[PDB]
Amino acid sequence: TEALYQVGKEFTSKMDLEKPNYIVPDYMPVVYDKLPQPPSHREAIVNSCVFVHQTLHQANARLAKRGGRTMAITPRHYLDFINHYANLFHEKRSELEEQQMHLNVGLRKIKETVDQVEEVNRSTALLKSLSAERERWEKTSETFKNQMSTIAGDCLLSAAFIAYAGYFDQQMRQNLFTTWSHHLQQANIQFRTDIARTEYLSNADERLRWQASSLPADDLCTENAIMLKRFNRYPLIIDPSGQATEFIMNEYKDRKITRTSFLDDAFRKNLESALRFGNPLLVQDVESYDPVLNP
Amino acid sequence: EPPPGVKANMLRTFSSIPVSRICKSPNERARLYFLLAWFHAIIQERLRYAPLGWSKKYEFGESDLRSACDTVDTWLDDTAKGRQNISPDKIPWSALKTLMAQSIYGGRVDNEFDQRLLNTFLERLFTTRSFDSEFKLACKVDGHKDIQMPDGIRREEFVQWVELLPDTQTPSWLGLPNNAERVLLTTQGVDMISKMLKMQ
């Protein structure tokens, strides 16, 4: 727990986790023994990250006692979690500032246009046509502070789901996400419960293209596609039906992806080519994994 | 796997053996095959009641049935030298009974009491009396009723008789007491429950 906490602290230094208006809950969901008694918002964030990491050990234990098949939880999962947290936090902050900048510029231009028409028929008709857009932009600009407040918790939950939830099925994914959300609730960490995970970590254009690439219209499939897009460690795909293979090949036709297998004689050569020319590579039969990929 | 019961066993037997095989020149041949099938079924069905039907789990299987069929054909052709009808008392009952007692279904037996039981079934089943109208394959299955010998002389009649057998088979069909299945059934019932409980 010490190592996880210190890694979280040092890695989230670039993060803007300072919330001076944060209130310490009376019952703090403490998982770090030497966490300061009046924790700060950043301290609560890293403590919740450590809790998220330990929750995967608890879940693996629960599936192990029921005879289920579990995959080992490693500190590299925690490193992927914190890396995704930093990247998603920065991305969401940048997108939200850019959207607010565009909305403010649009609103000031509409106000300037009203002043110009005051100081004619066509522009009055245009302003009448733009009233709904102006109202929507003012409302979205009003929601800016709430979005800013919920960014940290939303990104933490999204990164946890990306790092840890890939191997598990729908029920266990929901269980882990509910556990993390409840822990954030006990820690007074702000997050949204309305937006879906797939809607939050993917846009409609990407989902439409995924549907074009023959990705099945399913929430778990969309989550899998998001993991295949935002991965830190190279993905290992488990698909008995195998439609994931066609989805990957369709998504990477333009970049000239090559299908191969660990049991193929040319695999090494293929791998070398994929490494030298920077082309996407798809290797099947990972049950016969060749340790030459270890580096 | 072994057929679920005597009816299924005999249906599988009659399906496995070609029609032209059974319908050769001696009209009596079909009955012999039926008898063999019944015998085979009974023998196999006594394996399910592992300690009681036989003292040991023997591998009475398709090879034994095929060997018995070949022996029946060989000795029937030897006796009925290309004749349309062979008198039932002229059928080589001694040859078939001895060959099945010592070699076919007999070489697997390593216990004198299981050998006595096999001799028992062979003596009761393979006689001239099997060709009578009132021959009785089994006696007092449910206390009152019992299983009659079909009055068929062609294969299709025997197949119909097997197909018309009820779905109320009891170990008394095999000569065993009716309670010989009780415990087994109970276990399987409990087993079913467990499997059901394991799939929720």
Next chain:
Amino acid sequence: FVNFTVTRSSLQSQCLNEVLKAERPDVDEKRSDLLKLQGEFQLRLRQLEKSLLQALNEVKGRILDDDTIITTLENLKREAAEVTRKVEETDIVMQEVETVSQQYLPLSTACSSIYFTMESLKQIHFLYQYSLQFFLDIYHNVLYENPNLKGVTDHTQRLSIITKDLFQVAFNRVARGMLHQDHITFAMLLARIKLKGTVGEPTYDAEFQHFLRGNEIVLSAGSTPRIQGLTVEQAEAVVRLSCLPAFKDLIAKVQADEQFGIWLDSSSPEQTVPYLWSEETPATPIGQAIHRLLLIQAFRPDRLLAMAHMFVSTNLGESFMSIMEQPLDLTHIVGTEVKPNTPVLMCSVP
């Protein structure tokens, strides 16, 4: 790790779309065209919003100074309004498609339940491994090459025939690759699934819940009395079964029936289970079947399987399990049901 596991909703959608294609090809084609139209419509609306925002963001001075900006804004607003109009039109046509496809939801639910039961079948034996393609082959068999749909044209009767044949073919193909002792168990589950698909039948959750487990009801020394005519195990079974509201007066009903002992020693009591449960309204024949199943489990466990078969015969028909008694007709299965890519595994007991 990125695991692609089958979810109930996704399989339900797949089966609903497949039955819509098979039964209502015009409706399925219209639905596909509508989803494509709305996808590109939302795409166009997003592009129009982005273009409007960027046109406002990339204009210098005042908007009225450059009439080209005004014309572009007017064109964008006009196109947005008319694409939105097409959006409501596509929405109403989707309402038509949805009210058409509402009829086939129970079949898709049954399909998903059957597939997940087949997947759970691996828990009882290592040999019971079934892919999604196997169940999809069963479903295609039921939908497209079903001899019972040869001359039937009414959609409701076709759907009923398809629903019946789904259960029948699923049992046949799965049980051909199962040990006979397990067949009833599978049949039981199918019956329960078909029991959930009946609108007019109750849930029977408590009766099945006591059917399973049951022994977890701890009975003390004083809790279980000594009933004349029953053994200790039978007495505890009566006590546990009395926990139901319907069997609350079970000891009194058994004691008041002097003929009951005769029924306790009959060869096939499951055929003549006496009316020992108290109920205000008459139970359905399937409800009567569960009540007899409970009574048999309490009193004659050795005949439980037989009663279970009767239960299946009540839910799925008399001849539902009859194919397993027949010899394996391997010729037709190899010629028609087995693809050349699919190996025919023949697993035999010693």
